[PDB]
Amino acid sequence: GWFREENDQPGQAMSLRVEKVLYDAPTKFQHLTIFESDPKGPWGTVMALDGCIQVTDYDEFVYHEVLGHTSLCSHPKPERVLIIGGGDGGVLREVLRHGTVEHCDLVDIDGEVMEQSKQHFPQISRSLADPRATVRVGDGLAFVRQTPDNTYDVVIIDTAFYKDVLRILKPDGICCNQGESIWLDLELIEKMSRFIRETGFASVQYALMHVPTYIGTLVCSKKAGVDVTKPLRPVEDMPFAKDLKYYDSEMHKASFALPRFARHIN
Amino acid sequence: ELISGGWFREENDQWPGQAMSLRVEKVLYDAPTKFQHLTIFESDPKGPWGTVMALDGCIQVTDYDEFVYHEVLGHTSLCSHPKPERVLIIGGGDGGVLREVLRHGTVEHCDLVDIDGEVMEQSKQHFPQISRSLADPRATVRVGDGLAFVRQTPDNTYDVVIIDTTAFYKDVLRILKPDGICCNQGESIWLDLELIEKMSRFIRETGFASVQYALMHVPTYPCGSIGTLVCSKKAGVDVTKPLRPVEDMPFAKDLKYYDSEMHKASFALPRFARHINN
Ligand SMILES: C[S@@H](CCCN)C[C@H]1O[C@@H](n2cnc3c(N)ncnc32)[C@H](O)[C@@H]1O
Ligand SMILES: C[S@@H](CCCN)C[C@H]1O[C@@H](n2cnc3c(N)ncnc32)[C@H](O)[C@@H]1O
Ligand SMILES: COc1ccc(C2=NC[C@@H](C)N2)c(O)c1
Ligand SMILES: COc1ccc(C2=NC[C@@H](C)N2)c(O)c1
């Protein structure tokens, strides 16, 4: 058998050989597929949601180190962190390396994702049981609505709402979401960036990522003048810097340099 | 083999258990050549790709993305050179690199050698926007093996050598002038990290003073990432910061990918790979 991935945005398909199907069922919220890919390939275990791959053993370090560290290294002293989505635990694992982090909340709508990540991606999900984390099953929209002003230093969106994200951040707050591809959806990113800036964020900057197959991130600061393109707390000064396989300060700087057709985003 | 409405399947033997497929709208060419199997087709009009070129079942050019790897190859090499007057391109029968090279006012002549005359022929036909450079009076376009060509070239002929391909490295160093920049199509840091390190190491060894690997951001590559080894003949040259920034040259604003920030960014590698560049 072969898992086939397709996008409405057509005439193209990416196919992965299925070694063993590990989970395949709808959930309260979406279709969840987990499979062991060809042992001769690099991919390891693969997770898709509604047919779109979200996690592979092989590349997960990329998007988890970028979202975790681009945001937290852009913050003067991130103590309280919210993660919306992230039920696999990867961003949480990266967030929790930082010795400044006192507490992280994680809210994912789908408790089956977390359950299934516990069983099939222990390399990613081990962080869910960290004492500095509180993991909640529920809607992030509903969650941010019922959250006090000035609760978090950083909100990470790993999937009215953006007013509430702005509201729940402290004055020096960093918001970081999963952006669309500049190839696939330049139009969406332009719109998101304007949207976010208008709802109140002072600077919005798009960071690009290098994935083995195809993504990036919007990094949003509440206070202006702050150049998020240069690390405010370089990871190189921190004890875990050599533990990371993708992210460092040079990659952080490089990530905001956009091909010319997309530059006007930043 | 290929039919209209059928699917083009791209597989890679270094990466088993995956395939990237494209829906074929119109088969344009599908025959063996003297050297390779050339396959050209119009892809799904509702997709972004347009016309697609494959050699031995490996896609080499699409209308959508060609600007990336041609701008990266053309300008990273030429903006690292004080005065690129005479330019060699090995491979590149489609003319894409050549079109970028010739944007530069300092170029007097560019030689181009591609082993397969059918590639150039079929690029003139089905990718006019890439191959229009093949008719430029400042270009001499030749059918031949690049191995024999550089073997037969005098010492200190070229300011820049660009290897754009699907003992020889001794020759490239030899035929470059003292200020020479060599540039090649590099393998993926994902697929073949080791090849790049062995390659970078033997290039330096054969006698190039510095070697730096640049990364590109492509819309799709089912084999990881495509890169470029940018190599300096003279010592004390830093290819990672543009020697002649494109922002000063009248055609900068015509480029869709490359600029100085992209140039600098391209040499920042993922931590797992950074030892390649230091
Ligand atoms: C698996 S994670 C994939 C990203 C790479 N780590 C994506 C998660 O976002 C969750 N998600 C989607 N919408 C929401 C909302 N509205 N709230 C919380 N979590 C959400 C969804 O259940 C996935 O687990
Ligand atoms: C099409 S180009 C790759 C597309 C990026 N412009 C790859 C070309 O290299 C040629 N090639 C391969 N081997 C050689 C040799 N030995 N010499 C010259 N050209 C070569 C081959 O015919 C393609 O046209
Ligand atoms: C080679 O097949 C693959 C492999 C990985 C992904 C993937 N990893 C994260 C997310 C962006 N997509 C994919 O979509 C297809
Ligand atoms: C949509 O599927 C695609 C699209 C593009 C490529 C490609 N562009 C440059 C060359 C190296 N490969 C591909 O292989 C498959």
Q: Is B195 helix (H, G, I), strand (E, B) or coil?
A: helix
Ligand 4 pocket, residue B220 CB under 6 Å? yes
For residues A64 and A48, give the distance between their C-alpha atoms in angstroms, rounded to a whole number: 16
Q: Which resolution in angstroms does this entry have?
A: 2.2
Q: Whose CA is closest to B47, among B20, B25, B69?
A: B25
Q: Is B69 helix (H, G, I), strand (E, B) or coil?
A: helix
Q: Whose CA is closest to B17, among A209, A213, A7, A10?
A: A213
Q: How far is ligand 2, taken at its centre, from the CA of residue A17, in Å?
A: 31
As its CATH architecture, domain A1-58 has: Roll (2.30)
What is the fold, at CATH topology level, of the domain defined by B1-64?
Spermidine Synthase; Chain: A, domain 2 (2.30.140)
Residue B89 near residue B101, CB atoms below 8 Å = yes
Handedness of CA B140, B143, B149, B150 (dihedral sign): positive
> Which helix or strand (DSSP H or E) is residue A94 part of?
helix A90-95
CB contact under 8 A, A261 and B257: yes
DSSP code of residue A180? P
For residues A233 and A235, give the distance between their C-alpha atoms in angstroms, rounded to a whole number: 6
Identify the residue whose C-alpha is closest to ligand 4 atom 5: B220
Which residues on adjacent β-strands are paired with residue A178? A217
CB contact under 8 A, B18 and A12: no
CB atoms under 10 Å from CB of B29, counted, come to: 17
Cα nearest neighbour of A259 on chain B: B257
Residue that is written with structure tokens 């450079």 in the block: B133
Q: How far is ligand 4, taken at its centre, from the CA of residue B248, in Å?
A: 32
For residues B189 and A6, give the distance between their C-alpha atoms in angstroms, rounded to a whole number: 26
For residues B233 and B173, give the distance between their C-alpha atoms in angstroms, rounded to a whole number: 7
For residues A230 and A248, give the distance between their C-alpha atoms in angstroms, rounded to a whole number: 11
Q: Confirm whether B1-64 and B65-278 share one CATH topology.
A: no
Could you state, in order of their start, the residue ranges of all structural domains in chain B?
A: 1-64, 65-278
What CATH number was assigned to the domain covering residues B65-278? 3.40.50.150
B164 catalytic, yes or no? yes
Identify the residue whose C-alpha is closest to ligand 2 atom 13: B165
What CATH number was assigned to the domain covering residues A59-266? 3.40.50.150
Q: Which of B65, B94, B116, B164 is catalytic?
A: B164
* Burial class (CB within 10 angstroms; exposed 0-12, middle 13-18, buried 19+) of B272: middle
In chain A the beta strands, taken as DSSP E runs, fall at 2-6, 12-26, 31-37, 45-49, 52-56, 80-85, 103-108, 133-137, 152-158, 169-179, 203-208, 216-221
- DSSP of B122-139, one letter per residue? HHHHH-HHHHGGGG-TTE
Which residues on adjacent β-strands are paired with residue A134? A105
Q: Is A147 helix (H, G, I), strand (E, B) or coil?
A: coil
CB contact under 8 A, B272 and A213: no
Question: How is chain B split among helix, strand and coil, in percent rounded to 5?
Answer: 30, 30, 40
DSSP code of residue A264? G
Q: How far is ligand 3, taken at its centre, from the CA of residue A213, in Å?
A: 5
> Which helix or strand (DSSP H or E) is residue B111 part of?
strand B109-114
